[PDB]
Design a protein around this ligand. Structure first.
Ligand SMILES: CCC(=O)Oc1c(C)cccc1C(=O)O
Ligand SMILES: [Ca+2]
Ligand SMILES: [Ca+2]
Ligand SMILES: [Ca+2]
Ligand SMILES: [Zn+2]
Length: 316
């Protein structure tokens, strides 16, 4: 809507207070005009029609229970925008400052979040397996990264290209988490997963196996569940990414870590310049090696570490 840019304050899912960019026109709307062509957060009001209504609030204060998932969807999308802009010189998910839209309070007891081709969508969780999913910045950044991927590589969402698609979202969701720097980890979803159990997570990049995901190509899933295992076989790439960044010896293969920033540079380059809708794990390895080579030279440590990492996960 048309209005004047304002700053409101609220409490997120985890009870943390934050300021948020809003727009004033009779009501205060969750519309951030400070980034690209705007960030817009909607109320789906527990139904599944999208996007629902642009979030309207009478006084610019957002401390109601009902407001918290909105506060975080809105804020963490702003942080994710900032990451891609400042760190990769990318303007929004299409690179041309497309409006970023999110809807929260989707459906009832809904344990998922997704990119629907046009916007981000967050369920509130059933309060057992999940709390409102926008409460985790790695979740928000995972979702917005699905938009980035669809506008760039276009990785089809099934089988190996689908596993790569998922891994890219976990990788950048994690790099954004570290970018915001509030107790970052190499785990996925820990902030909104199983409120009753501390210490766990939906996935682990450091040790995928912890939650039944493969950490070696020889262990990949080839059945048909989960689109040919997109959230399962992503463990193999997540592990490889972890290794490139943090190093380690995995099944006897030693990897010298090169750090998170170089990991991000390499995978961002592979994503936007070399992967295609049907890339498989072997072609991602070549893409990662060629990207590292572009960035640091064929005789670099960086290239050598990428190869070590894919060797360690059994991807040639
Ligand atoms: C880290 C965010 C995530 O994985 O969200 C999903 C959930 C919670 C359920 C089903 C699919 C997804 C997804 O984004 O792929
Ligand atoms: Ca209010
Ligand atoms: Ca995390
Ligand atoms: Ca938990
Ligand atoms: Zn995903």
């Amino acid at each position: 809507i048309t209005g004047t840019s304002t700053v409101g304050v609220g409490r997120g899912v985890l009870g943390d207070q934050k300021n948020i960019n809003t727009t004033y026109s009779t009501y205060y709307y969750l519309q951030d005009n400070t980034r690209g062509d705007g960030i817009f957060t909607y109320d789906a009001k527990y139904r599944t029609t999208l996007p629902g209504s642009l979030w309207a609030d009478a006084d610019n204060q957002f401390f109601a229970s009902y407001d918290a998932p909105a506060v975080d969807a809105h804020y963490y999308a702003g942080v994710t925008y900032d990451y891609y802009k400042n760190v990769h010189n990318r303007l929004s998910y299409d690179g041309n400052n497309a409006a970023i839209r999110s809807s929260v309070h989707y459906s009832q007891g809904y344990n998922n979040a997704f990119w629907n081709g046009s916007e981000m969508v967050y369920g509130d969780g059933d309060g057992q397996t999940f709390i409102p999913l926008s409460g985790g910045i790695d979740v928000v950044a995972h979702e917005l990264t699905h938009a980035v991927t669809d506008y760039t590589a276009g990785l089809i969402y099934q089988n190996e290209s689908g596993a790569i698609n998922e891994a890219i979202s976990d990788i950048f969701g994690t790099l954004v988490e570290f970018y915001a720097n509030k107790n970052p980890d190499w785990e996925i979803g820990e902030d909104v997963y199983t409120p009753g159990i501390s210490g766990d997570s939906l996935r682990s990049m450091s040790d995928p196996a912890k939650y039944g995901d493969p950490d070696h190509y020889s262990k990949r899933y080839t059945g048909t569940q989960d689109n040919g295992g997109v959230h399962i076989n992503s463990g193999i790439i997540n592990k490889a990414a972890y290794l490139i960044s943090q190093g380690g010896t995995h099944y006897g293969v030693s990897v010298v870590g090169i750090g998170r920033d170089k990991l991000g540079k390499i995978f961002y380059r592979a994503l936007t310049q070399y992967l295609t809708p049907t890339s498989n794990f072997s072609q991602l390895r070549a893409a990662a090696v060629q990207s590292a080579t572009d960035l640091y030279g064929s005789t670099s440590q960086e290239v050598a570490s990428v190869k070590q990492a894919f060797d360690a996960v059994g991807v040639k």
